[PDB]
């Protein structure tokens, strides 16, 4: 039990404080799931609604983990980064393939001339 917690607080729960709690639980609620929880229950949540928001945040962490794990399969350069070249190869070869230009535009809009942090890339995409 929290040794330093007061006495007050209720009549709902601010979603900023709910995002704070999820983040301490080892999650990372984005603006998207923070938006759809507003566009459903409002600026403050009941305990049941807080649980659903946490569940939502569990799914998004699992999704991000899968993406980071995916890009790491092509990490020949020990660990951390991938080149724009490797990146466009993935994005133009598989799925709803982006065109050569679409792959360039997106990677050029992201950052460095030849080196991309794929962990931050996935964070942003989700």
């Amino acid at each position: 039990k929290d040794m330093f917690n007061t006495k007050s607080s209720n009549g709902k729960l601010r979603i900023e404080d709910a995002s704070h709690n999820a983040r301490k639980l080892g999650l990372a609620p984005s603006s998207t799931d923070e938006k759809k929880i507003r566009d459903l229950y409002g600026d403050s949540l009941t305990y049941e609604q807080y649980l659903e928001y946490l569940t939502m945040c569990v799914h998004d962490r699992d999704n991000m983990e899968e993406l980071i794990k995916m890009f790491s399969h092509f990490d020949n350069n020990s660990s951390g980064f991938l080149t724009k070249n490797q990146m466009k190869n993935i994005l133009t070869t598989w799925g709803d393939a982006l065109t050569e230009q679409e792959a360039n535009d997106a990677l050029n809009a992201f950052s460095s001339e030849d080196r991309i942090n794929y962990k931050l890339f996935c964070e942003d995409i989700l």
């Binding site: 993406l67 993935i90 598989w94 799925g95 709803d96 393939a97 982006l98 679409e102 997106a106 995409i125």
Partner: peptide
Amino acid sequence: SLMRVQAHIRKRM
């Protein structure tokens, strides 16, 4: 999946 990544990239026009 990669399908998700591509769809989000496209949503950024």
